[PDB]
Amino acid sequence: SDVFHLGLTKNDLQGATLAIVPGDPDRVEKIAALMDKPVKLASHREFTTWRAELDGKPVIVCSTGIGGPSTSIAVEELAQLGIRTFLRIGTTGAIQPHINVGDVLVTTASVRLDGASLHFAPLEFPAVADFECTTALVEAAKSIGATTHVGVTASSDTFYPGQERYDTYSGRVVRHFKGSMEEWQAMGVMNYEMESATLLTMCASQGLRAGMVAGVIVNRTQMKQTESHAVKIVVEAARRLL
Amino acid sequence: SDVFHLGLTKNDLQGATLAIVPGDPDRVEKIAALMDKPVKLASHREFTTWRAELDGKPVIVCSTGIGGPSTSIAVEELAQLGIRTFLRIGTTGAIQPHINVGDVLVTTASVRLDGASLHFAPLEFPAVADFECTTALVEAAKSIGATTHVGVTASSDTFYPGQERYDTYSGRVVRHFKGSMEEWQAMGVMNYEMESATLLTMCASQGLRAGMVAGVIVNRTQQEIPNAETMKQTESHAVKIVVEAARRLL
Amino acid sequence: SDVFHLGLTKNDLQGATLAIVPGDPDRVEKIAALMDKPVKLASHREFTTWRAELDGKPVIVCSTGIGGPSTSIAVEELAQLGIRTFLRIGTTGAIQPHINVGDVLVTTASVRLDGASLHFAPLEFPAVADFECTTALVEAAKSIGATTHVGVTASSDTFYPGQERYDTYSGRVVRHFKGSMEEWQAMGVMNYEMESATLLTMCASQGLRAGMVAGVIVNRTQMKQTESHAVKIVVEAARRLL
Amino acid sequence: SDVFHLGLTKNDLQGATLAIVPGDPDRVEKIAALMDKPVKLASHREFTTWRAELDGKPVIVCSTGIGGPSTSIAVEELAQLGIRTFLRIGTTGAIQPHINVGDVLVTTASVRLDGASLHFAPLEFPAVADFECTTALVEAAKSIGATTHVGVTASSDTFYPGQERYDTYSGRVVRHFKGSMEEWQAMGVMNYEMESATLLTMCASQGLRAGMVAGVIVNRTQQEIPNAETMKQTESHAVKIVVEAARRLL
Amino acid sequence: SDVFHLGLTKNDLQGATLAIVPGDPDRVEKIAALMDKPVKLASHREFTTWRAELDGKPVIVCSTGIGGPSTSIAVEELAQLGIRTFLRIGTTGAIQPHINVGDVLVTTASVRLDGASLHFAPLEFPAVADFECTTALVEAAKSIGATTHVGVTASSDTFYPGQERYDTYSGRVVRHFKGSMEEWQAMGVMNYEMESATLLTMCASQGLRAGMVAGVIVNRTQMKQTESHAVKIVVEAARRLL
């Protein structure tokens, strides 16, 4: 292995330069299955990697695990191996009334509620997605007729307090985040997820292209099939980025 | 006047919902001149407004003056008057070697080195441009064949220390900004300008669409010898691009 | 032109070392008119400059435009041309009950609600006015018998949310500034304006003397003539500073 | 499942109130194997859970995955299930010369270089370990004669820049973290790891007891030449120490 | 004098390496009196120093005065003189219902509501006590059967607003600290005092061992004898640390 965590060698990628990075290890195979000659490369910790062909071009699929920390490791090590483009496919919770479960969301930029993005650029730097990847994702979504929403996403280091959930053990939310969801709502933020801030920031500040798309599995103001459409959309986007 | 600073009435706009907002008052007429039936509406402080027609649709052109403060006033008051889409056309200094004077830059999002954006959203919120406006700007730039670059822009509250210029009275830059340009360069930031952070943040957090395009009049990594001609010509292309973008946004 | 924005040459100032800097371009001529041999020097963007004589000494009057950004450019470029003393005359909104419209306010120091001051000194540095300029302004105000108030001023980068105005398009104020006016009131702050923080900080941290005086055109807790008195006061102060 | 991610039910724990939480899923079974009647309960995402008996008391072992985010989920959901005591056993990089690979480190408190801890308490709150858990860990380490060091640990959201590693794709470290390792060294910080800040803070601020122990697999001040054997042996001792500590905490 | 403030010479300490540092000058003699051959060494400003013997080992007792500023001076200068271990004995206000006046509190780490700790380490660094000193204090407390509580302490630069007291001249608390006590309570913080944050941080970040124990003289949610027990406990702890 040429990297510390992924257990992958440069040759394993066979010249691949684009990677689809879902958060859940169990989704890696599903994504690879939509492409040609899918093969499992490695599985260590929360990092599962598969290789496949798209239009005769080798493509990588690697899980990041939940959170910016594990995400930064995967992205960094994949970059060390030649990957220059990253497309994240995730699951998300909508916080706007007009957005419905099943809808697909494309992130233009993210509210940085994480700590890892700060290890690449100060807070004033935008966690913005690459224009080409965003475009590809939008078109891909349109190509299959999925109800899509494009905009800002709140990327949190926590699933609970950071997303102002009170149905918890403590049933309490620290002051900084109390009343925070309502604030994001009034600002037009579409959803909550946990890896885009780190992904977009570290990529945008290091010459790497990144895109972000997620399927709505829940709406805070009010599933397997939704994941399916989002997966197709990201593979279709990758195709347009090759 | 229905607003405190612009000296404009709702009726003046004749139903206009899009405005092109240059920083310099003197550029307002130039921009309006590329459209039909251009008419001056008002002039107060650094706020000069003109109205014109584009494809049979009334369009506004209003100068913001330099900086997020004056920019936030103009945008806020124009919004009070019905404007929902804002396209900024400015001048900028490139900080990357591969970018040349005369090139056109489209901002996807901005590094917030201003104070006004913070009056609309905390620092963690991205100063991102509207996807539709950015797309229109990109296509418009392509439509006339201008050498274009798309990416991140550093928007500063100051022309000098914030952009780490030392050719100043004090010849000194406060610690926070010392060595800052090099940091931005390593991060891929394309340029320095002074209104996008405020514009994009206040719009993105209030349901308003905004786009940002600027012409390169200088490159910080490549010494000098400016050319009023070339410079005036660069402004020309950027103006044409923003008007073309507006057309696609109407 | 020896500077990038002002369109002025060192010789234009004829040895002037003090400048009165109003925010509104249209007020420049009014101020110059109270002095001798007033002459317009230039007009570019929001920067209008006039020269005049006061007690046989050349004095500059230059508009800064609204906000610290344009203010820092004007001050910096004027300094490059020899100006060492700056007196700002502005308009302001009082936030204390005992202060009335028409009253004149002299700022001793400012609450930094701007971004430009930070480009000269970290937030912990005080946006304090020069003792000599403050003194001159106080005496000048007294010399004409104007009802005067001396104290702290809140200098905001925005006219609306930063000054907690809700009569706006969004009718909303970001969390950081919600309930902020009341806080300033309890702290004795006298008013809101938009250039003193940047002016005083950049001057106080660069060996430049600065003073700040403004006329109250509105009281948040409850016009042409007020501007008139403030203008006289600043010209009278300049006279004592020459 | 009574929780959203762990896929566990209250009944699965059989009254367990203490959990050993390693970062790597693959270590869960190893830890459970040192106890009695070890049984796998679930495996979802980076969360692998096993149950076992220690002195006739049911004990849980659950992987957190790398980082405070996944750690906070696991801890929160385990707490929802009754766990009140958490003992983390990890791997770490030493940054002090006197500390050797193979040594065991017990964290009294951590430098918060993460983002998740901030979602439980402001930065001024200390990421301190529970006194009882720390004591148990210290005694346990002593009971087997392991070379131990007790002190402060720097817990980072990143493996690379946050730990000031330059052997990377960009080969660059953002300003805030440039020269940071040397600063931590001068302050006596013993090591770098990636979950203690979040673990200790969220537990210390919510009435939950937590302890932290890690085996040194590398020393940043002493070049390299890792040894899978030694490394695998270090993990072994750390595991034994944490299980022994749990025993004293039951 | 070999130091600027304490008025002490290296020889005065006769090889002492541990010091008990109370906040009140008047408590120095009381503490020294429990040991052998107590002798007053100096008295300057709020810094009173005494020397004594404990198990044949010279020990120092020096008052820090109230607050991190004076505390940092005393600790720094004592360190310059050879002291490597510091045990603070103070008075404190409990903020938890289950803690009673008279109880003894041992601080494991502190919430940094001070400014001095920041002059030694950034805010993210923990104001944690030395494990050995904490252990000694716990055992010492047990040795005399004192009702003890071990945990986190909020160390404030102010006695009033920082501890959210409203019975003041202004009867007002700045926004940052409004509702702060309740927050600390929900987080399990045991008490409020004014020197531990600075003490623990500066020591923990400079290779110096420090411990912190205080007697509860008041409970915010609901005296000479309490001080007595705390003094014994700290002397007993020092004995175990020699």
Place this chain on the structure above:
Amino acid sequence: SDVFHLGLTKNDLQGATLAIVPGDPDRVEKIAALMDKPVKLASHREFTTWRAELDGKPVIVCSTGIGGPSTSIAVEELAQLGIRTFLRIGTTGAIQPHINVGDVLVTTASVRLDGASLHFAPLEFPAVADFECTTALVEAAKSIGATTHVGVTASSDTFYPGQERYDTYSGRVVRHFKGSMEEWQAMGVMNYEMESATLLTMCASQGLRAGMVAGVIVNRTQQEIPNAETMKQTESHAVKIVVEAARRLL
């Protein structure tokens, strides 16, 4: 006692509304001695209080001890007792070449390097002195012909690292303060002391008038060789100046 720390009763002040507040308890009597009918009122912790008459008006003199924490207690409790005006007289270290030992410095505002001021107003609020008190101090200094300097002062919570002193036990200064003195120097800051930030902020934000004057006992830019005599003489003039200022403020 009507207050928790000062051990003073409202009656003790006999209607006094102004207090001179030195940092050192030992200076309280010296200051009181220049006035009429000086009497010691109390002595507790670092708080020593004396009362005296100035032009037939009762005046208080109370030591604050070193630092904003003890300073805030004294000021708060004195205010509870009726004091509305505070004049601080201290000792200071100059950081500018043109300032000499023995010179007197009047602070117009302070750089807030303390923590206590933040307990009264956020960092953006200026630690500015009262205009009337500053004026009185300036005139008083002039009245005796002392070489005076008026300007900004850096008020630090620490005597050593915060004032970037390396002649210490650790011989190290935390990153935030490394190279800080030079920055303050370039900004024109005249000196370092340890109570003005807290004093001016808490007073300026609570309707209390405050002034600040200090005598230079050392200049950081000009090596050393202190003189107890000169030093004791500098304190003398500063004391005379503050008493004279109080007289003009009564």
